[PDB]
Amino acid sequence: MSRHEGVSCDACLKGNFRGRRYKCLICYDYDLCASCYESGATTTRHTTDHPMQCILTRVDFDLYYGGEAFSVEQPQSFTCPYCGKMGYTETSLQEHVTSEHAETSTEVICPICAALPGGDPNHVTDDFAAHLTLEHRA
Amino acid sequence: QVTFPIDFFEHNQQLTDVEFGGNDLLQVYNAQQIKHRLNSTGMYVANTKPGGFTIEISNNNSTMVMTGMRIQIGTQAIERAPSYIEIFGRTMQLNLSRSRWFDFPFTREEALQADKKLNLFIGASVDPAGVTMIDAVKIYGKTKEQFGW
Amino acid sequence: DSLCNKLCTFTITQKEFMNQHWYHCHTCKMVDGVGVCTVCAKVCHKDHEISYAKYGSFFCDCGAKEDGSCLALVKRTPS
Ligand SMILES: [Zn+2]
Ligand SMILES: [Zn+2]
Ligand SMILES: [Zn+2]
Ligand SMILES: [Zn+2]
Ligand SMILES: [Zn+2]
Ligand SMILES: [Zn+2]
Ligand SMILES: [Zn+2]
C-alpha cells in the first residue's frame, strides 16, 4: 500500500495521492497532501495554525520506521489538537492533555483513532480528555 | 571559515538529557522515538518533505550548554542521505560516498544561543523518491561553569 | 609549542587497542575502522578533512603505517 485510498486532498483535489496524508484535528473531514501542506494551502475555514495530524501509507510507514517492528495499525505520532504541539506518544499525549489543557473543552477531531486504521477519521468529542481516558487507553 | 580545534569533541561530553522533535519530524514520529533512534544504531529517521526538514533540539538540563553535534548518515541509503545541512546560519554540504559521521562544533556565540533550544535544517536528499534519511544524531556540550556562562 | 612535545598514541598503543578519541581523515581515504589519534589529526593530517569518529577502543593507524610517514612518532622541534 503506497496510496491513501479513499482520501483526497482538499486543496489540489487529488485522490489516492502518494505521500503523507494530513488530517485537520479541528477542521471537519478536510485533508491535505504533503505538497499542498508544505505550500501553506488555506481555505475560508482552515488555517495553517490548525493542529495537524500526519498519517502515512504502508510503503511510507516502512520507509519512515525502517528497522523497527511498529506497524501501520500502531500509530506513534499524535498532535495536540488544541495546542499545535506534535509528536506525542499515547501516554505522552494524554499526559499533556491532562496537565496543560485540563479545562479546555473546545471541539476537536482526536488524532489517534483518526490516524488509526479502521477507526473514525473524523470522530468529534467535546471532551478529548474523556476520549483519552475512556476509550483511548492502552 | 571558522577553524575549530580538532580535539573539540574531546573537551565535550555526550549528552543523554536531550529531546529531539520539530513539526517536520513530529508529524511522523514522537519525541521519545526520535531520541531513541538518534541515540541508537541499526535504525534511522526519515522525512519525505521536499527541500528539507527542521529538527528542534531541546536541552532539559539547565546546568549544561550545547557545544557541538555529530550526525551519522549513510548506513541505510547514501542516495536518501541529505545533500547538505544548516544551523545557526551556517550551511555545510554532505558529499557522501558511504556511511560516516559529520561533525559541527558550535562557536561561543552559537553555544550561547543554544542554551535551551536550537533548530537544525536538513536539505532534501538526491533520492528520486524525495526521502531525507539521517541515522543517528549525538549532541555534545559542557557544564555552565566549564563553559564560563 | 605544547603540541610539538606531544607524541602519537601509537608508540604506546602499538597494534593493541586502548580507549581513546579517534577521528576519520577523509582526505586520506581512511574511514570506518581506520583513523588517527588527536596528535596525528592535528599534525600528521593538518588542514585535512577530518571528522571525529568516536571515543572508544582503537589504535592509531597513522602511527601503524610501516612507511614511517607518521610525523608524530618522534618529538618535533618548533619552527
Ligand atoms: Zn494537495
Ligand atoms: Zn482546519
Ligand atoms: Zn497543547
Ligand atoms: Zn478518538
Ligand atoms: Zn597518532
Ligand atoms: Zn590525511
Ligand atoms: Zn601520525
From Swiss-Prot, chain A:
Q: What induces it?
A: Up-regulated by FGF2 in gastric cancer cells.
Annotated S-S bridges: none
Q: Which domain of life is it from?
A: Eukaryota
Which compartment or compartments is the protein found in? Cytoplasm; Late endosome; Lysosome
Residues that bind Zn(2+) 2, according to the entry? C24, C27, H46, H50
N-acetylserine, modified sites: S2
State the similarity comment.
Belongs to the KCMF1 family.
Complexes and interactors: Component of the SIFI complex, composed of KCMF1, UBR4 and calmodulin (CALM1, CALM2 or CALM3).
Q: What is this protein called?
A: E3 ubiquitin-protein ligase KCMF1
Give the organism, scientific name.
Answer: Homo sapiens
- Which gene is the coding source of this polypeptide chain? KCMF1
Q: Which residues of the full protein are shown?
A: 1 to 138 of 381
Curated annotation (Swiss-Prot), chain C:
Domain of life of the organism encoding this protein: Eukaryota
Residue ranges annotated as zinc fingers (UBR-type) are: 2-75
Positions bound to Zn(2+) 3: C40, C44, C62, C70
According to its UniProt record, where is this protein located?
A: Cytoplasm; Cytoplasm, Cytoskeleton; Nucleus
Give me the residues that bind Zn(2+) 2, please: C25, C28, H45, H48
Which positions bind Zn(2+) 1?
C8, C37, C40, C60
Effect the entry attributes to changing F58A: Reduced but not abolished ability to recognize type-2 N-degrons
- How does the entry describe the domains? The UBR-type zinc finger forms a pocket that mediates recognition of type 1 N-degrons. It can also recognize type-2 N-degrons via two phenylalanines, Phe-17 and Phe-59, on its hydrophobic surface. In addition to substrate-binding, the UBR-type zinc finger probably positions substrate proteins in the proximity of the bound and activated E2-ubiquitin conjugate to enable their ubiquitination.
Similarity comment: family membership: Belongs to the UBR4 family.
Function in brief: E3 ubiquitin-protein ligase involved in different protein quality control pathways in the cytoplasm. Component of the N-end rule pathway: ubiquitinates proteins bearing specific N-terminal residues that are destabilizing according to the N-end rule, leading to their degradation. Recognizes both type-1 and type-2 N-degrons, containing positively charged amino acids (Arg, Lys and His) and bulky and hydrophobic amino acids, respectively. Does not ubiquitinate proteins that are acetylated at the N-terminus.
Q: How does it assemble?
A: Component of the SIFI complex, composed of KCMF1, UBR4 and calmodulin (CALM1, CALM2 or CALM3). Interacts with E2 conjugating enzymes UBE2A and UBE2B. Interacts with RB1.
Query: Which disease is this protein implicated in?
Result: Episodic ataxia 8: A form of episodic ataxia, a neurologic disorder characterized by episodes of poor coordination and balance. EA8 affected individuals have attacks of unsteadiness, general weakness, and slurred speech. Additional variable features include twitching around the eyes, nystagmus, myokymia, and persistent intention tremor. Inheritance is autosomal dominant.
Q: What name does UniProt use for this protein?
A: E3 ubiquitin-protein ligase UBR4
Origin organism is Homo sapiens
The encoding gene: UBR4
Which portion of the entire protein is included? 1655 to 1733 of 5183
